[PDB]
């Protein structure tokens, strides 16, 4: 009595995604995640001036280009042997942090929310699933249903302007957005002025007000209606984080620390243990057993028997691990926002001080949205601080020369999860460039040992009581905020 459901395109994610599920007795019993578009940035990059990489790599994704830019310039800083100044480090954090706010807001509202909020009866808000299990369907008190839906929809509409303001903030020291000009090997290209710091701060305060007063309350209210969605979309419960937003010049300390949590245990992150498998991916490897990214290979092969995705399969100590706000917030375990502390008590009867106090609820559809909203607040607190630390007039750029032969790795967290760029230079040109991105860790296919990727695994057990309106499949997928351009590059 199994039924197959195939969804291609899985919309309201970035890029080209197919999801296939098998359903039996009203639940998903198997799943496959497929990325169907390839460009091959790692091939395109070969033979170029290594400095070009921080422009080229941004075109992997127009939603998170600052993350790729950050990883690339850090790889170049490492390979070129240059140390960034205090003000360069802070300026880079302000450019990138403004897009963290943009990206999370864009995701929750403009990608995720139409699985819960009933939009107006015009395209692109319709057509939609006939039985979409929306706020207007769930809340049985009709006036409350209308009021809650209108509250959510008005925030969706307002968030269009708030996310645009976040890009003004990125452009302030980044030049433009998408695709900044302001981050380069050696630091940042424009020293902040007092006036431009004040202009960034004024916009930031408007974004921060929306985050605290509108976005956080909506997420906690939404979860209080969809309590069943804290109880499914579980997955491996293994998470990894690389560290993001260095808070000191030697990159010893971060806003959100590196770490791994596997099978209920915390451990340190050791980059030596990252490798990629391709048994079910459209790629050829010169040797068996998975490849560490420092010897990564990008030899596309769409004819590879048994393969089903252009996404490779990264594993840590041979374990699938997921990434993103859930991962970072779980690893760091920061104190929850005052709004979260209050609304968890008021709306759920939950006493919670720190993220891990959510317990099992963290590893779920709604847990992922909560983690993302809380991280948006946490990032806003950091930006507010960085705006006080940044020094008008202080040098942000240090000169460098392209080395003949070198290697460097830039580690960061994209809004969607752990990100590194590995750069090898020979004869002053890119010899190899290997990208291990965020959605790569989430939306990957089975490895050579048949272990499902995190999204594939998290789909197992998701309820599908109505096969013609399988809304929880998309809800699970979108809770991960996938970017398939990043996943495949």
């Amino acid at each position: 009595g199994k039924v197959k459901i195939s969804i291609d395109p899985l919309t309201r994610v970035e890029g080209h995604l197919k999801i296939e599920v098998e359903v039996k007795d009203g639940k998903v019993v198997d799943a496959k995640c497929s990325g169907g578009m390839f460009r091959g940035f790692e091939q395109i990059l070969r033979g170029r001036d290594p400095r070009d990489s921080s422009q080229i790599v941004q075109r992997i994704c127009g939603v998170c280009p600052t993350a790729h830019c950050t990883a690339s310039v850090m790889a170049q800083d490492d390979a070129f042997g240059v140390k960034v100044t205090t003000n360069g480090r802070i300026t880079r954090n302000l450019i990138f942090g403004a897009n963290y706010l943009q990206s999370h807001i864009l995701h929750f509202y403009h990608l995720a929310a139409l699985d819960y909020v009933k939009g107006p009866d015009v395209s692109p808000f319709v057509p939609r699933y006939a039985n979409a299990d929306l706020l207007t369907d769930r809340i049985k008190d009709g006036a409350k249903a209308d009021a809650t839906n209108t509250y959510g929809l008005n925030q969706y509409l307002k968030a269009l302007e708030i996310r645009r303001i976040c890009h003004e903030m990125v452009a302030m020291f980044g030049g433009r957005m998408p695709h900044v000009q302001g981050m380069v090997v050696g630091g940042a290209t424009e020293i902040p002025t007092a006036d431009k710091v004040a202009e960034y701060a004024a916009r930031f305060k408007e974004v921060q007000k929306f985050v605290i007063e509108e976005y956080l309350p909506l997420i906690y209210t939404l979860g209080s209606v969809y309590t069943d969605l804290f109880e499914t979309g579980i997955g491996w419960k293994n998470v990894i984080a690389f560290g993001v937003f260095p808070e000191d010049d030697d990159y010893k300390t971060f806003l959100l620390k590196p770490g791994v949590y596997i099978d209920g245990k915390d451990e340190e992150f050791d980059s030596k243990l990252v490798k990629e498998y391709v048994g079910h991916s459209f790629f050829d490897h010169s040797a068996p057993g998975g490849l560490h990214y420092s010897v990564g290979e990008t030899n596309p092969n769409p004819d590879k028997p048994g393969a089903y995705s252009f996404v490779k399969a990264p594993r840590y100590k041979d374990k699938p691990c997921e990434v993103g706000p859930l991962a970072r917030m779980w690893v760091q375990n920061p104190e929850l926002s005052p709004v979260g502390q209050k609304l968890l008590k008021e709306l759920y009867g939950i006493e919670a001080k720190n993220f891990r106090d959510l317990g099992d609820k963290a590893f779920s559809i709604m847990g992922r949205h909560v983690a993302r909203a809380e991280e948006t607040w946490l990032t806003a607190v950091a930006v507010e601080k960085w705006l006080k630390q940044v020094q008008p007039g202080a040098e942000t750029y240090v000169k460098s020369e392209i080395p003949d032969a070198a290697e460097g790795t830039g580690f960061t967290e994209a809004p969607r999860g752990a990100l590194l760029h590995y750069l090898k230079i020979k004869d002053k040109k890119i010899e190899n460039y290997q990208i291990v991105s965020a959605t790569l860790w989430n939306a990957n296919p089975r490895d050579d040992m048949g272990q499902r990727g995190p999204i594939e695994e998290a789909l197992i057990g998701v309820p599908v009581p109505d096969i013609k309106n399988p809304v929880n499949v998309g809800r699970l997928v979108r809770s991960y905020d996938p970017x398939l351009g990043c996943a495949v590059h």
Partner: protein, 279 residues
């Protein structure tokens, strides 16, 4: 107040053209969506998914045959029978599955369109996906149309990404033309099919640093005063109105901040590289 029907498709894109559109002002994106266009299909933002989303796209392409704009973001890969870009899966009168390639999608929808508008340098000219080293046979809309012998009005709005003013302005000008062609002639295009409205000015000729250039005052590093030419600026070989319009609602632009990398040009990126070596 009839809105322009739009089907927005993505090939080998990064969604940056879409994101840049979301940054529009005067009008902003809310008014664009509710008042200016009917965005019928767009994979990043639309409510429906899978079968329902594709069925809706095809229904609109039929009902609005010869009366919708096909907006294309990203390049079209032709190697390996188009299999480097699968845009969806269709189901027959029987129950079987068929993948749809970017090639197949464009070949299908372009002849149904009123006009095709290639937004971004990828779709207009090939861009980064078509750059040296790629193995996907990545192609622009104009080249794919030429190979396919498709004659359909085509307008290119390049940039990586294009400014929202360029995309909105071009689309509004095209729609105005359709509604009243003699009152609103189509924007004059250059040899590369992009409107002179936005791409007629040379950046360098219009640059506020031109006085410094003329006096040989060149910035020694990014954070020193002077013209950016020695840092790699491609303003001299680039045609766009960025010096006037600036970016992100007038907040900054590439040349003030750093350098122009020639992102609107048909030879971007290879003809504009290395980015940090002077022209």
């Amino acid at each position: 107040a009839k809105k322009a029907p739009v089907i927005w498709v993505q090939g080998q894109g990064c969604t940056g053209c879409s994101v840049s559109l979301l940054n529009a002002v005067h009008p902003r994106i809310k008014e664009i969506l509710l008042d200016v266009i009917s965005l019928e299909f767009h994979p990043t933002v639309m409510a429906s998914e899978g079968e329902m989303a594709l069925a809706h796209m095809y229904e609109i392409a039929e009902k609005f045959n010869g009366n919708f704009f096909l907006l294309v973001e990203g390049a079209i890969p032709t190697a390996k029978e188009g299999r480097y870009c699968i845009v969806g899966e269709t189901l027959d009168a029987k129950g079987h599955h068929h993948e749809v390639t970017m090639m197949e999608l464009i070949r299908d929808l372009a002849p149904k369109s009123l006009a095709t508008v290639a937004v971004g340098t990828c779709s207009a000219y090939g861009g980064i996906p078509a750059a040296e080293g790629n193995v996907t046979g990545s192609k622009s809309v104009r080249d794919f149309f030429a190979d396919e012998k498709i004659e359909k009005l085509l307008v290119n709005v390049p940039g990586c990404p294009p400014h929202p003013d360029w995309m909105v302005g071009t689309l509004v000008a095209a729609w105005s033309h359709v509604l009243n062609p003699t009152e609103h002639p189509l924007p004059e295009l250059d040899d590369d099919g992009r409107p002179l409205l936005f791409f007629g000015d040379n950046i360098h000729e219009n640059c506020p640093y031109l006085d410094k250039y003329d006096n040989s005052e060149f910035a020694e590093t990014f954070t020193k005063p002077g013209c950016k030419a020695e840092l790699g600026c491609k303003g001299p070989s680039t045609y766009a109105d960025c010096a006037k319009r600036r970016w992100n609602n007038g907040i900054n632009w590439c040349v003030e901040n750093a350098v122009c990398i020639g992102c609107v040009e048909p030879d971007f990126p290879d003809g504009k590289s290395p980015f940090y070596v002077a022209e």
